[PDB]
Amino acid sequence: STLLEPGSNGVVRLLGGPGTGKSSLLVDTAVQHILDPESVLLLTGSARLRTAARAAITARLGVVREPLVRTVHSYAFAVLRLAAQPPPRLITSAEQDGIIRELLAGDLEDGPVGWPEQLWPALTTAGFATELRDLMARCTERGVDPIALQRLGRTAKRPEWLAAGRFAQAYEQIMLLPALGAAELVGAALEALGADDELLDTERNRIKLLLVDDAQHLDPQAARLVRALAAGTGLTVIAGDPDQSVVLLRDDTHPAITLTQSYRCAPEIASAITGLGQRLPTRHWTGNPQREGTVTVRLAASTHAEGTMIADALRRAHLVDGIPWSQMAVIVRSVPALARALTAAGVPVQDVPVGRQPAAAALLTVLDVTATGHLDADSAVALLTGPIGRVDPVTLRQLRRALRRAPPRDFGDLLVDAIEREPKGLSAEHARTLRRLRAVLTAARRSPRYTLWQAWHASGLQRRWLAASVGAQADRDLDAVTTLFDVADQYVNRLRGLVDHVTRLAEAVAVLSVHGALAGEWDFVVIAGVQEGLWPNMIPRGGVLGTQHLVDVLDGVADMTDRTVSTRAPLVAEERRLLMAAMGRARTRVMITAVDSLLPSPFCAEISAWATPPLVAPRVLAPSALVGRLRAVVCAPAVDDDARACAAAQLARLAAAGVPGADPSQWHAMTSLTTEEPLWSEHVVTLSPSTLQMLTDCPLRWLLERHGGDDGDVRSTVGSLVHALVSETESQLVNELEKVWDDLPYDAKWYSDNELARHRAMLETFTRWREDTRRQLTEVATEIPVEGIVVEPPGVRVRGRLDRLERDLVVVALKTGKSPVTKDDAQNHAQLAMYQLAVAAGLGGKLVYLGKATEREQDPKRAEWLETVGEAAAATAGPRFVARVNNGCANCPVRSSCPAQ
Ligand SMILES: Nc1ncnc2c1ncn2[C@@H]1O[C@H](COP(=O)(O)OP(=O)(O)NP(=O)(O)O)[C@@H](O)[C@H]1O
Ligand code: SF4
């Protein structure tokens, strides 16, 4: 307190625990030294914390000037910006590792670097250049010149470090023949402070406070600017906590100021944090005595039961205890499953490429129409099913039946000719969704960053997405089209190149990882997923170049020149700091969750000493979770004679205000049939001989598969293309099947010409059948429509398409199956005996199998048969259809709604 005064000098160090008044004491000394705007320099260490401390000072200060609030990287650029009295910075690592892919492919083509010849197949891989980039990016943070990395390649017998140092030296000579990376920005500025030797004295004479902040995360190359700027003038405060590694604080000759009172954390949270610091290689601080807090550890028995009790405890707190959303958080060790099972209880919770999302990709299809000049068929259907002018799949089927009234032509060709000029056919409501697509393609074709805005103006849906903000998808799409207008501007400053480049490119529960959870406050913190393979991280840190072994020989004597512990797993004592500092955010209470069928980590057995069987079916406060259970203890045979009264007493309070599922009108077991009528009632039923086999077999399959339920093929229309050719010279028919075959929906075009071969020969099999049996038979006609009245008084009235007559009359029915029906199974064949009974009365049978020509016969039992047609056709009358189990109870369409299974 006596060391922070306007009359004072030197370096003061300010260290304290997690939560204490550190960063709000640098703001308290920024203002107290002003009451000069300049020399009040901060180094906040984040781009978002720079504005958090700027607005804190400038509100506490009649207009004012600005204290200089910056970061370390943004300050080392301003030194380089002034030392050129412009120093440019290179792009993000796409353009910086696009240089790495060139120098490796430019080395494998040759035979100077000298890779150790085992790594020769590795050099073309994308996974080698994203590891070579890290051996340079982790020496750049530690100030190691490539002429000094090669000294390590000789003292130890490691050939791939001499090869890596010669890469990092040859890399820095084509980047200067400047161009600075991201991490190379502090190290390049520090060479320019000691170069001029008057640039120092014209910098130190400016600054007066140097309120550097968050000193613990500072690199040993960024820890030397703070030692250079604070060489001599005024007074400097360092601050931060020294025992959270994850200027220097631990070793200094400068006087320190400790802080032990927390101001945030409860005293029961402050004993679990400092209780874990006992088995850890200023660890004593106390909690806020005004608060009272709870720490508890819960276990689950599965993965889905974890997300069901997290969404329990997040729902108990807001809805009963009253703490709002956005004072809650869910911290996970690392993000790839939990946000889906936590939204399903009704909790507000706050990747995919840019040109792939449907609100953005529907507008890039307007540009491909515009760039070519004519719109195709496959990209004119893709505008109707998209967001611009939208149609559900049953209104494509209403366009086609209205456009084809203007063989039928294909829908891909009729659509384009309705956008080019609008026909006056439909005009009801489909005229509007076609005028919307003429308004876009006339605006963009009459006009590259000025056309793409003019398309967004014509397809007027910035108005429709603001009024409807289903209200989340408008805020997901508007937060995605504004990433086109940002990326499309970035290519214009440097329209077939627009499409070519983009193609390659509140009050909620914050779910975030541990490294993102070092800025929030959050009254309630859940640490989900502390278990065996996940939190004590046993993914081994080995690699090819030995990056994790270089980084702990070069940065300290953590390992000697022995590769024994170089590639094991993340260190456990340095992994305990993450769970010790994630609990350091909650100011009221902490819940720690892990599943155990997936085995809990040993950190869950250590918290249970300081906390205040696993669940397998947990309780929820979801409204669809109440009314499910309340209906299950009232519709019960066999417990709870007293609780049954309490069950139905609470459903009457749910049903009076809404809550769907509550009232006994809403229950799916309580609904009643619509009609239960006697069908036709009143009459002559009508039948065809191809349903009579089916009707007798099972009369429920007649009702559901003939009327509605029929799931759609390519094998049944070829079977009718054979019947058309056969009914019309055996070489004049092969030429007829050959032309028409090329338009059939066959994938695998090796199979279309392989299925033609068995259907070409099946016409030669038929003419090889005719000449054999034209001595015993004689054709009367072919494809006679049979119609008449049979079993007249109900009458059954057989109608339809006898295939081929012959005469010794007889009845020939041609089939194209491969496997024939047996000999004694065709004596009761219901199709032939309906034609045979047609031949007799008013106005033997053959069953020729073209394919694999084994024919079957039926002998010329009429009273036993004619009573069966009248007995079966009477069962197509009433309700309550019978579901017999037949041979066809497999590859039948209606089976998921059968009551016999
Ligand atoms: N004198 C005070 N009176 C009331 N509240 C205070 C006082 N001093 C600090 N606080 C509050 O205590 C909390 C501690 O925040 P602060 O001390 O600024 O964080 P920090 O410890 O510097 N940063 P970090 O450890 O990374 O979370 C904040 O909500 C402050 O507003
Ligand atoms: S599964 Fe059996 S009862 Fe059901 S429709 Fe098919 S044949 Fe008829």
PDB file of C-alpha atoms in Angstrom, residues 341-542:
ATOM      1  CA  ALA A 341     -28.845 -33.981 -24.255  1.00  0.00           C
ATOM      2  CA  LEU A 342     -28.895 -30.702 -22.331  1.00  0.00           C
ATOM      3  CA  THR A 343     -30.958 -28.805 -24.916  1.00  0.00           C
ATOM      4  CA  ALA A 344     -33.490 -31.677 -24.851  1.00  0.00           C
ATOM      5  CA  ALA A 345     -34.511 -30.587 -21.347  1.00  0.00           C
ATOM      6  CA  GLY A 346     -34.963 -26.958 -22.399  1.00  0.00           C
ATOM      7  CA  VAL A 347     -31.780 -25.101 -21.444  1.00  0.00           C
ATOM      8  CA  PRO A 348     -30.383 -22.206 -23.525  1.00  0.00           C
ATOM      9  CA  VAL A 349     -26.915 -23.154 -24.780  1.00  0.00           C
ATOM     10  CA  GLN A 350     -24.660 -20.836 -26.750  1.00  0.00           C
ATOM     11  CA  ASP A 351     -16.874 -26.337 -37.961  1.00  0.00           C
ATOM     12  CA  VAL A 352     -18.760 -26.325 -41.291  1.00  0.00           C
ATOM     13  CA  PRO A 353     -17.208 -24.567 -44.339  1.00  0.00           C
ATOM     14  CA  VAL A 354     -18.515 -21.242 -45.572  1.00  0.00           C
ATOM     15  CA  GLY A 355     -19.682 -22.188 -49.042  1.00  0.00           C
ATOM     16  CA  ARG A 356     -21.430 -25.397 -47.949  1.00  0.00           C
ATOM     17  CA  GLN A 357     -24.208 -24.101 -45.696  1.00  0.00           C
ATOM     18  CA  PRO A 358     -27.625 -23.988 -47.411  1.00  0.00           C
ATOM     19  CA  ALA A 359     -28.289 -20.275 -46.915  1.00  0.00           C
ATOM     20  CA  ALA A 360     -24.858 -19.429 -48.329  1.00  0.00           C
ATOM     21  CA  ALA A 361     -24.572 -22.181 -50.948  1.00  0.00           C
ATOM     22  CA  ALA A 362     -27.939 -21.293 -52.464  1.00  0.00           C
ATOM     23  CA  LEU A 363     -26.606 -17.873 -53.409  1.00  0.00           C
ATOM     24  CA  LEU A 364     -23.379 -19.203 -54.923  1.00  0.00           C
ATOM     25  CA  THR A 365     -25.544 -21.228 -57.307  1.00  0.00           C
ATOM     26  CA  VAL A 366     -26.899 -17.910 -58.584  1.00  0.00           C
ATOM     27  CA  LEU A 367     -23.341 -16.933 -59.490  1.00  0.00           C
ATOM     28  CA  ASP A 368     -22.644 -20.093 -61.506  1.00  0.00           C
ATOM     29  CA  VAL A 369     -25.782 -19.451 -63.540  1.00  0.00           C
ATOM     30  CA  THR A 370     -24.597 -15.862 -63.975  1.00  0.00           C
ATOM     31  CA  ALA A 371     -20.997 -16.677 -64.935  1.00  0.00           C
ATOM     32  CA  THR A 372     -21.768 -19.252 -67.634  1.00  0.00           C
ATOM     33  CA  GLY A 373     -24.800 -17.542 -69.207  1.00  0.00           C
ATOM     34  CA  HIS A 374     -27.320 -20.397 -69.365  1.00  0.00           C
ATOM     35  CA  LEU A 375     -28.827 -22.280 -66.431  1.00  0.00           C
ATOM     36  CA  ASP A 376     -28.690 -26.070 -66.361  1.00  0.00           C
ATOM     37  CA  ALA A 377     -31.246 -28.610 -65.198  1.00  0.00           C
ATOM     38  CA  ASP A 378     -29.430 -29.904 -62.115  1.00  0.00           C
ATOM     39  CA  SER A 379     -28.942 -26.363 -60.779  1.00  0.00           C
ATOM     40  CA  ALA A 380     -32.417 -25.064 -61.579  1.00  0.00           C
ATOM     41  CA  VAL A 381     -34.095 -27.718 -59.465  1.00  0.00           C
ATOM     42  CA  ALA A 382     -31.561 -26.895 -56.735  1.00  0.00           C
ATOM     43  CA  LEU A 383     -32.965 -23.366 -56.466  1.00  0.00           C
ATOM     44  CA  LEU A 384     -36.533 -24.521 -55.839  1.00  0.00           C
ATOM     45  CA  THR A 385     -35.663 -26.901 -53.015  1.00  0.00           C
ATOM     46  CA  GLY A 386     -33.431 -24.248 -51.438  1.00  0.00           C
ATOM     47  CA  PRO A 387     -34.002 -21.166 -49.284  1.00  0.00           C
ATOM     48  CA  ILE A 388     -34.646 -18.607 -52.055  1.00  0.00           C
ATOM     49  CA  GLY A 389     -38.022 -19.802 -53.288  1.00  0.00           C
ATOM     50  CA  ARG A 390     -38.843 -22.927 -51.353  1.00  0.00           C
ATOM     51  CA  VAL A 391     -41.038 -25.956 -52.041  1.00  0.00           C
ATOM     52  CA  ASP A 392     -41.659 -29.049 -49.931  1.00  0.00           C
ATOM     53  CA  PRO A 393     -41.539 -32.427 -51.771  1.00  0.00           C
ATOM     54  CA  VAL A 394     -45.323 -32.607 -52.328  1.00  0.00           C
ATOM     55  CA  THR A 395     -45.282 -29.318 -54.238  1.00  0.00           C
ATOM     56  CA  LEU A 396     -42.662 -30.454 -56.689  1.00  0.00           C
ATOM     57  CA  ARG A 397     -45.260 -33.104 -57.506  1.00  0.00           C
ATOM     58  CA  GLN A 398     -47.834 -30.361 -58.115  1.00  0.00           C
ATOM     59  CA  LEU A 399     -45.546 -28.406 -60.431  1.00  0.00           C
ATOM     60  CA  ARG A 400     -44.914 -31.458 -62.619  1.00  0.00           C
ATOM     61  CA  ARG A 401     -48.578 -32.299 -63.050  1.00  0.00           C
ATOM     62  CA  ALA A 402     -49.209 -28.643 -63.994  1.00  0.00           C
ATOM     63  CA  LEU A 403     -46.199 -28.080 -66.255  1.00  0.00           C
ATOM     64  CA  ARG A 404     -46.720 -31.303 -68.213  1.00  0.00           C
ATOM     65  CA  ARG A 405     -50.211 -30.197 -69.229  1.00  0.00           C
ATOM     66  CA  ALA A 406     -48.522 -27.460 -71.270  1.00  0.00           C
ATOM     67  CA  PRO A 407     -44.341 -39.233 -74.052  1.00  0.00           C
ATOM     68  CA  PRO A 408     -43.922 -36.559 -71.376  1.00  0.00           C
ATOM     69  CA  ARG A 409     -40.821 -34.400 -71.304  1.00  0.00           C
ATOM     70  CA  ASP A 410     -38.514 -34.395 -68.304  1.00  0.00           C
ATOM     71  CA  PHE A 411     -39.042 -31.998 -65.414  1.00  0.00           C
ATOM     72  CA  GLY A 412     -35.472 -30.707 -65.564  1.00  0.00           C
ATOM     73  CA  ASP A 413     -36.136 -29.359 -69.056  1.00  0.00           C
ATOM     74  CA  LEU A 414     -39.640 -27.993 -68.450  1.00  0.00           C
ATOM     75  CA  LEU A 415     -38.585 -26.013 -65.381  1.00  0.00           C
ATOM     76  CA  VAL A 416     -35.895 -23.970 -67.154  1.00  0.00           C
ATOM     77  CA  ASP A 417     -38.295 -23.087 -69.962  1.00  0.00           C
ATOM     78  CA  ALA A 418     -40.707 -21.681 -67.359  1.00  0.00           C
ATOM     79  CA  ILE A 419     -38.125 -19.340 -65.827  1.00  0.00           C
ATOM     80  CA  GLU A 420     -36.922 -18.140 -69.239  1.00  0.00           C
ATOM     81  CA  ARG A 421     -40.524 -17.250 -70.098  1.00  0.00           C
ATOM     82  CA  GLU A 422     -43.478 -17.741 -67.767  1.00  0.00           C
ATOM     83  CA  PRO A 423     -46.230 -19.920 -69.260  1.00  0.00           C
ATOM     84  CA  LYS A 424     -49.823 -19.140 -68.332  1.00  0.00           C
ATOM     85  CA  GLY A 425     -50.654 -22.695 -67.279  1.00  0.00           C
ATOM     86  CA  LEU A 426     -50.623 -22.870 -63.494  1.00  0.00           C
ATOM     87  CA  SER A 427     -50.819 -19.204 -62.363  1.00  0.00           C
ATOM     88  CA  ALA A 428     -52.424 -20.034 -58.975  1.00  0.00           C
ATOM     89  CA  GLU A 429     -49.558 -19.874 -56.473  1.00  0.00           C
ATOM     90  CA  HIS A 430     -46.693 -21.402 -58.463  1.00  0.00           C
ATOM     91  CA  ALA A 431     -46.533 -18.191 -60.501  1.00  0.00           C
ATOM     92  CA  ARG A 432     -45.214 -16.329 -57.457  1.00  0.00           C
ATOM     93  CA  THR A 433     -42.366 -18.736 -56.669  1.00  0.00           C
ATOM     94  CA  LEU A 434     -41.349 -18.538 -60.326  1.00  0.00           C
ATOM     95  CA  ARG A 435     -41.429 -14.730 -60.432  1.00  0.00           C
ATOM     96  CA  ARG A 436     -39.164 -14.717 -57.380  1.00  0.00           C
ATOM     97  CA  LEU A 437     -36.609 -16.753 -59.323  1.00  0.00           C
ATOM     98  CA  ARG A 438     -36.900 -14.503 -62.357  1.00  0.00           C
ATOM     99  CA  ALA A 439     -36.294 -11.487 -60.121  1.00  0.00           C
ATOM    100  CA  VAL A 440     -32.971 -12.869 -58.899  1.00  0.00           C
ATOM    101  CA  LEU A 441     -31.626 -14.075 -62.226  1.00  0.00           C
ATOM    102  CA  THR A 442     -32.570 -10.865 -64.033  1.00  0.00           C
ATOM    103  CA  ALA A 443     -30.909  -8.654 -61.419  1.00  0.00           C
ATOM    104  CA  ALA A 444     -27.670 -10.647 -61.401  1.00  0.00           C
ATOM    105  CA  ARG A 445     -27.508 -11.084 -65.187  1.00  0.00           C
ATOM    106  CA  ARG A 446     -28.052  -7.368 -65.800  1.00  0.00           C
ATOM    107  CA  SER A 447     -24.983  -6.672 -63.656  1.00  0.00           C
ATOM    108  CA  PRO A 448     -18.269  -8.643 -58.735  1.00  0.00           C
ATOM    109  CA  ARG A 449     -19.026  -7.497 -55.199  1.00  0.00           C
ATOM    110  CA  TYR A 450     -21.793  -5.303 -56.628  1.00  0.00           C
ATOM    111  CA  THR A 451     -23.701  -8.139 -58.310  1.00  0.00           C
ATOM    112  CA  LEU A 452     -23.693 -10.395 -55.234  1.00  0.00           C
ATOM    113  CA  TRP A 453     -25.316  -7.667 -53.187  1.00  0.00           C
ATOM    114  CA  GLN A 454     -27.881  -7.085 -55.933  1.00  0.00           C
ATOM    115  CA  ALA A 455     -28.870 -10.761 -55.829  1.00  0.00           C
ATOM    116  CA  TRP A 456     -29.338 -10.528 -52.029  1.00  0.00           C
ATOM    117  CA  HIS A 457     -31.637  -7.558 -52.676  1.00  0.00           C
ATOM    118  CA  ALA A 458     -33.878  -9.326 -55.198  1.00  0.00           C
ATOM    119  CA  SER A 459     -34.394 -12.561 -53.249  1.00  0.00           C
ATOM    120  CA  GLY A 460     -35.995 -10.601 -50.497  1.00  0.00           C
ATOM    121  CA  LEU A 461     -35.277 -12.621 -47.412  1.00  0.00           C
ATOM    122  CA  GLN A 462     -33.265 -10.273 -45.240  1.00  0.00           C
ATOM    123  CA  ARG A 463     -36.694  -8.878 -44.360  1.00  0.00           C
ATOM    124  CA  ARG A 464     -38.205 -12.341 -43.825  1.00  0.00           C
ATOM    125  CA  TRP A 465     -35.350 -13.524 -41.609  1.00  0.00           C
ATOM    126  CA  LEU A 466     -35.488 -10.482 -39.335  1.00  0.00           C
ATOM    127  CA  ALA A 467     -39.226 -10.723 -38.691  1.00  0.00           C
ATOM    128  CA  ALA A 468     -39.014 -14.464 -38.013  1.00  0.00           C
ATOM    129  CA  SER A 469     -35.993 -14.074 -35.718  1.00  0.00           C
ATOM    130  CA  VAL A 470     -37.501 -21.528 -36.370  1.00  0.00           C
ATOM    131  CA  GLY A 471     -36.305 -18.254 -34.868  1.00  0.00           C
ATOM    132  CA  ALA A 472     -32.833 -19.663 -34.310  1.00  0.00           C
ATOM    133  CA  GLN A 473     -32.242 -20.711 -37.915  1.00  0.00           C
ATOM    134  CA  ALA A 474     -32.792 -17.151 -39.099  1.00  0.00           C
ATOM    135  CA  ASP A 475     -30.113 -16.092 -36.613  1.00  0.00           C
ATOM    136  CA  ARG A 476     -27.913 -18.951 -37.783  1.00  0.00           C
ATOM    137  CA  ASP A 477     -28.350 -18.004 -41.445  1.00  0.00           C
ATOM    138  CA  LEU A 478     -27.955 -14.234 -41.013  1.00  0.00           C
ATOM    139  CA  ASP A 479     -24.803 -14.968 -38.999  1.00  0.00           C
ATOM    140  CA  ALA A 480     -23.564 -16.951 -42.038  1.00  0.00           C
ATOM    141  CA  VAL A 481     -24.376 -14.794 -45.060  1.00  0.00           C
ATOM    142  CA  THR A 482     -22.378 -12.007 -43.388  1.00  0.00           C
ATOM    143  CA  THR A 483     -19.420 -14.385 -43.614  1.00  0.00           C
ATOM    144  CA  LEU A 484     -19.829 -14.404 -47.384  1.00  0.00           C
ATOM    145  CA  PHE A 485     -19.795 -10.585 -47.570  1.00  0.00           C
ATOM    146  CA  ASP A 486     -16.638 -10.644 -45.426  1.00  0.00           C
ATOM    147  CA  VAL A 487     -14.868 -13.377 -47.407  1.00  0.00           C
ATOM    148  CA  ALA A 488     -16.090 -12.081 -50.768  1.00  0.00           C
ATOM    149  CA  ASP A 489     -14.641  -8.661 -49.934  1.00  0.00           C
ATOM    150  CA  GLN A 490     -11.281 -10.248 -49.053  1.00  0.00           C
ATOM    151  CA  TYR A 491     -10.950 -11.625 -52.601  1.00  0.00           C
ATOM    152  CA  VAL A 492     -12.054  -8.421 -54.374  1.00  0.00           C
ATOM    153  CA  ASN A 493      -9.383  -6.244 -52.710  1.00  0.00           C
ATOM    154  CA  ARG A 494      -6.769  -8.670 -54.026  1.00  0.00           C
ATOM    155  CA  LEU A 495     -16.678 -13.316 -60.854  1.00  0.00           C
ATOM    156  CA  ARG A 496     -15.507 -16.818 -61.716  1.00  0.00           C
ATOM    157  CA  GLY A 497     -12.790 -16.246 -59.116  1.00  0.00           C
ATOM    158  CA  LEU A 498     -15.422 -15.598 -56.446  1.00  0.00           C
ATOM    159  CA  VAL A 499     -16.891 -19.085 -56.820  1.00  0.00           C
ATOM    160  CA  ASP A 500     -13.417 -20.587 -57.268  1.00  0.00           C
ATOM    161  CA  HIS A 501     -12.073 -19.193 -53.985  1.00  0.00           C
ATOM    162  CA  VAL A 502     -15.087 -19.636 -51.677  1.00  0.00           C
ATOM    163  CA  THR A 503     -15.395 -23.302 -52.711  1.00  0.00           C
ATOM    164  CA  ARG A 504     -11.917 -24.085 -51.358  1.00  0.00           C
ATOM    165  CA  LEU A 505     -12.502 -22.108 -48.148  1.00  0.00           C
ATOM    166  CA  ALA A 506     -26.781 -13.330 -24.062  1.00  0.00           C
ATOM    167  CA  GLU A 507     -28.607 -15.500 -21.505  1.00  0.00           C
ATOM    168  CA  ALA A 508     -27.354 -19.038 -22.102  1.00  0.00           C
ATOM    169  CA  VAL A 509     -25.198 -21.747 -20.537  1.00  0.00           C
ATOM    170  CA  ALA A 510     -21.651 -21.394 -21.820  1.00  0.00           C
ATOM    171  CA  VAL A 511     -20.148 -24.809 -22.585  1.00  0.00           C
ATOM    172  CA  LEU A 512     -16.414 -24.354 -23.127  1.00  0.00           C
ATOM    173  CA  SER A 513     -13.047 -25.975 -22.495  1.00  0.00           C
ATOM    174  CA  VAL A 514     -10.547 -25.262 -19.728  1.00  0.00           C
ATOM    175  CA  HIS A 515      -8.375 -22.804 -21.649  1.00  0.00           C
ATOM    176  CA  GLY A 516     -11.418 -20.727 -22.550  1.00  0.00           C
ATOM    177  CA  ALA A 517     -12.601 -20.759 -18.953  1.00  0.00           C
ATOM    178  CA  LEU A 518      -9.991 -18.353 -17.630  1.00  0.00           C
ATOM    179  CA  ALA A 519     -12.019 -15.151 -18.014  1.00  0.00           C
ATOM    180  CA  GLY A 520     -15.571 -15.750 -16.750  1.00  0.00           C
ATOM    181  CA  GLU A 521     -17.023 -15.450 -13.268  1.00  0.00           C
ATOM    182  CA  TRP A 522     -20.009 -17.868 -13.224  1.00  0.00           C
ATOM    183  CA  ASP A 523     -21.889 -18.425  -9.884  1.00  0.00           C
ATOM    184  CA  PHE A 524     -22.324 -22.147 -10.728  1.00  0.00           C
ATOM    185  CA  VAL A 525     -19.660 -24.269 -12.440  1.00  0.00           C
ATOM    186  CA  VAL A 526     -20.028 -27.904 -13.546  1.00  0.00           C
ATOM    187  CA  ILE A 527     -16.818 -29.760 -14.426  1.00  0.00           C
ATOM    188  CA  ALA A 528     -18.082 -32.576 -16.633  1.00  0.00           C
ATOM    189  CA  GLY A 529     -15.953 -35.486 -17.746  1.00  0.00           C
ATOM    190  CA  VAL A 530     -13.101 -36.086 -15.306  1.00  0.00           C
ATOM    191  CA  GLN A 531     -12.241 -39.672 -16.119  1.00  0.00           C
ATOM    192  CA  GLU A 532      -9.378 -42.039 -16.772  1.00  0.00           C
ATOM    193  CA  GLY A 533      -8.242 -41.637 -20.375  1.00  0.00           C
ATOM    194  CA  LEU A 534      -9.496 -38.078 -20.615  1.00  0.00           C
ATOM    195  CA  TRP A 535      -8.478 -35.736 -17.838  1.00  0.00           C
ATOM    196  CA  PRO A 536      -5.110 -37.265 -16.685  1.00  0.00           C
ATOM    197  CA  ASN A 537      -4.099 -37.205 -20.289  1.00  0.00           C
ATOM    198  CA  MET A 538      -2.465 -40.477 -21.329  1.00  0.00           C
ATOM    199  CA  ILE A 539      -2.149 -39.660 -25.033  1.00  0.00           C
ATOM    200  CA  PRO A 540       1.630 -40.036 -25.514  1.00  0.00           C
ATOM    201  CA  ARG A 541       3.552 -36.977 -26.641  1.00  0.00           C
ATOM    202  CA  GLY A 542       5.877 -38.878 -28.956  1.00  0.00           C
TER     203      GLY A 542
END
